[PDB]
Homo-oligomer: A and B are copies of this chain.
Amino acid sequence: FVNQHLCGSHLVEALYLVCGERGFFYTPKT
């Protein structure tokens, strides 16, 4: 089940998908 350290790599996939032409700041700290 790993942790945030691997779960976040997929959260970002959808994150920038929402932005599309835009970007975003990702901080796997909290």
Contact A28 B14 (CB under 8 A): no
In the complex, chain B residues whose CB is within 8 Å of the CB of A29: 21-23
The interface bits of chain A over 8-30 (1 if a CB of B lies within 8 angstroms of the residue's CB, else 0) are: 11111110110111111111110
Q: Size band of the A side of the interface? A: 20 to 34
In the complex, chain B residues whose CB is within 8 Å of the CB of A7: 1-2, 6
* New A-B contacts (20) at CB < 8 Å, excluding given A5-B17, A26-B26: A1-B7, A2-B7, A5-B20, A6-B10, A6-B14, A8-B16, A9-B12, A9-B16, A12-B12, A12-B16, A12-B26, A13-B13, A14-B17, A17-B17, A19-B28, A22-B29, A23-B25, A23-B26, A23-B29, A24-B27
